[PDB]
Structure formats: C-alpha cells, structure tokens
Amino acid sequence: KKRQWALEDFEIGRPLGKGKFGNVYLAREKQSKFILALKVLFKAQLEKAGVEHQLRREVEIQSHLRHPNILRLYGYFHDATRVYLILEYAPLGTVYRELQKLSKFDEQRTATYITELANALSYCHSKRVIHRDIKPENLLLGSAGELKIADFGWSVHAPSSRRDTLCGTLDYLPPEMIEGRMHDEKVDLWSLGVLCYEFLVGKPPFEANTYQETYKRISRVEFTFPDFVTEGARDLISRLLKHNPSQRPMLREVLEHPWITANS
Numbered sequence: 001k002k003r004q005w006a007l008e009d010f011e012i013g014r015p016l017g018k019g020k021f022g023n024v025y026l027a028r029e030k031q032s033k034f035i036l037a038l039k040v041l042f043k044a045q046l047e048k049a050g051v052e053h054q055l056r057r058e059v060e061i062q063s064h065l066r067h068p069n070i071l072r073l074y075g076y077f078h079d080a081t082r083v084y085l086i087l088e089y090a091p092l093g094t095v096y097r098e099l100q101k102l103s104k105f106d107e108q109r110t111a112t113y114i115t116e117l118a119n120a121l122s123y124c125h126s127k128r129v130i131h132r133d134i135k136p137e138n139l140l141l142g143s144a145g146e147l148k149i150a151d152f153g154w155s156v157h158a159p160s161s162r163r164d165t166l167c168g169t170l171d172y173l174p175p176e177m178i179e180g181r182m183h184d185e186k187v188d189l190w191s192l193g194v195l196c197y198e199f200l201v202g203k204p205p206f207e208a209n210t211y212q213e214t215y216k217r218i219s220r221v222e223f224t225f226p227d228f229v230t231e232g233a234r235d236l237i238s239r240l241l242k243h244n245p246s247q248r249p250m251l252r253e254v255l256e257h258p259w260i261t262a263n264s
C-alpha cells in the first residue's frame, strides 16, 4: 500500500445506496481518473455500536483477499468526523435488487451464482475465513455480471465462538449460530443452501413473520419446496440444509453436484 488518501483525492458521484452507519457513493480518483465506490461512515454512528473491533476486521480481511468473486477493498482513511472505505465498484448493483427485479431466477442463473459463490467461498475457507453473512444484499455484480462477495464485516477466523449480538434477521444463520453455539466453515454452507432456495423460490426457506417463528423454523430445519423447484435442486438444497454441520457437503461436492452442471 503506502498510500494515505483524503476526501480531496475523490470527486464523489451519485449515491449508490445504503443508510446504516453511512452511505455508499460512486467516486472518482482525480489523479488517475479511476472509478470506485467510497463508503462513508460518520464515526460517531459507529462507536455507539462498538463496531470499532469489527469494522477493523472488515477493512483488514477484505484488503488481503484477492479473488474475482470477492469485492476488492483498496484502502481507507478517516475524516475529522468520518471514515471512508475505498472499494471496488460493482457496475450491476446488488443481487438483492436483481431478485426484486425478476422475482425468481432460472436454474442457469441460480446454478451460476451458486458456482461463483462456492469458488469465492472455497478461497476464503482455504484461509479459515468464514463470512457468516451471505445475504443476497451482500452480493454484488461486476461489469460482466459475475457474483461478487462483499461486506466481510461479520467475517471471522474459524473455528470460532459467537458472542455476537446478532442484530438483524436470522433468515441466513444455521442452528449453531442462532442457538449461539460454536461453529466453523460449515456455517457458510448452510447460507449457500438458503441462497439457492431463495434464488429459485423468491424468498428464503425459513422466512417468517417474526424473529421468533423464524428461529424455530431454522433450529427445527422446517422448510418445503413449491412444485416448480426441480429434483436436482431440492437434492442439493436438502444436502446443504441439514442440521448437523458435519453432514453438510464440502464445496467440491457443491461445484460437482450434477444439477450444478445446469450453469456456466
């Protein structure tokens, strides 16, 4: 690295999105004309949530990991009242919008995203990095439409223990992370299972009206397949969404699954 920037090196463009600790803007590196994403955090909005030692992880991890399906993080710098992150810019938005845009995905688009996803995960896992936060809203799209994993905020070394207060929805967490038990790389395989189901049905398999009824549905692994989901998909999803971490497949089996060869 060896490059410390300032808000003055970038011409902020249109607001890409968000509203949490801050926003994400399209931005232009004045010197080289380079285009990227600049995510701003108000600093104050962070401290009062103690992410200090977690946003620290988001920045450090996502910085060293380099893979075509991982969103690259270039560097960062703090304002007088803020903290900006210099991220790779993903031209086609989040996968979350792609969904509200098509409702469901076909078996080739689902099989392909699941592929790129498994490869990308197999990499982080090659390095004991577990994401634990695979939402279709933490999945971007590169200029050629390839899936790109982002927001390694909840990322962590593994095997590990979850203190973590686990704020938002449970739609994507496995019985172990929700019943606050220990866990490993296998948590990212249950998530891959959910995504697959969501990419094909339009909603997650455990979706509920309350955090509490989802919690049940998850721990008891209670999910059903609408009539259109093909067998080959039910199979893979049923293989991934098994309660016992050790019984879920490896990524090879996922990248080799018969039905997975209905992609690109």
Ligand SMILES: O=C(O)c1ccc(Nc2nccc(Nc3ccccc3C(=O)O)n2)cc1
Pocket: 016, 017, 018, 024, 037, 039, 087, 088, 089, 090, 091, 092, 093, 094, 097, 137, 138, 140, 150, 151
């Ligand atoms: O549709 C659009 O206009 C749209 C949405 C997304 C992108 N890409 C992009 N690139 C880099 C970072 C990034 N962060 C986010 C942007 C909005 C919401 C959440 C995030 C995030 O941090 O995951 N989003 C481009 C256009």
